From Swiss-Prot:
Chemical reaction(s) catalysed: a 1,2-diacyl-sn-glycero-3-phosphocholine + H2O = a 1-acyl-sn-glycero-3-phosphocholine + a fatty acid + H(+); 1,2-ditetradecanoyl-sn-glycero-3-phosphocholine + H2O = 1-tetradecanoyl-sn-glycero-3-phosphocholine + tetradecanoate + H(+); 1,2-dihexadecanoyl-sn-glycero-3-phosphocholine + H2O = 1-hexadecanoyl-sn-glycero-3-phosphocholine + hexadecanoate + H(+); 1-hexadecanoyl-2-(9Z-octadecenoyl)-sn-glycero-3-phosphocholine + H2O = 1-hexadecanoyl-sn-glycero-3-phosphocholine + (9Z)-octadecenoate + H(+)
Range covered out of full length: 23 to 145 of 145
A biological-process GO annotation: defense response to Gram-positive bacterium
Active site residues per record: 48, 99
Keyword annotations from UniProtKB, A to Z: Autocatalytic cleavage, Calcium, Disulfide bond, Hydrolase, Lipid metabolism, Metal-binding, Phospholipid metabolism, Pyrrolidone carboxylic acid, Secreted, Signal, Zymogen
Residues holding Ca(2+): 28, 30, 32, 49
Gene name of this polypeptide: PLA2G1B
Protein name: Phospholipase A2
Disulfide bonds, paired cysteine numbers: 11-77, 27-123, 29-45, 44-105, 51-98, 61-91, 84-96
């Protein structure tokens, strides 16, 4: 769920408020996403979007009433490392992995302020 994804990004980027810093950035970071990613950070968000789309395709995710944004899973942050839990069932585990991979991706790419609150004409 979004609560967990927020904590994961803070795990990798302890100075950030991720639901502010990484929402409405580029063509992909935030609800929806279309067009060509504007930079590597925006590409991290495109990959994450694709990951959530694949999660919705899984037989195990079709059995729950809640989407990737509201589906709670278990993970830990320790020494700024993210670990998804073996106690997660299949859908939860898949979403946990999407989130972990994106949090790590965000931490490894430049942040370009010119792409924050991007005009949708660009997408
Ligand atoms: Ca998106
Ligand atoms: Cl990690």
């Amino acid at each position: 769920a979004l609560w967990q994804f927020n904590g994961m990004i803070k795990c990798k980027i302890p100075s950030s408020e991720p639901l502010l810093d990484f929402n409405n950035y580029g063509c992909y970071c935030g609800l929806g996403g279309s067009g060509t990613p504007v930079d590597d950070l925006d590409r991290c968000c495109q990959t994450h979007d694709n990951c959530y789309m694949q999660a919705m395709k899984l037989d195990s995710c079709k059995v729950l009433v809640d989407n990737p944004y509201t589906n709670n899973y278990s993970y830990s942050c320790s020494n700024n490392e993210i670990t998804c839990s073996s106690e997660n069932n299949a859908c939860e585990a898949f979403i946990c992995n999407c989130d972990r991979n994106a949090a790590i991706c965000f931490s490894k790419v430049p942040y370009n302020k010119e792409h924050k609150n991007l005009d949708m004409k660009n997408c």
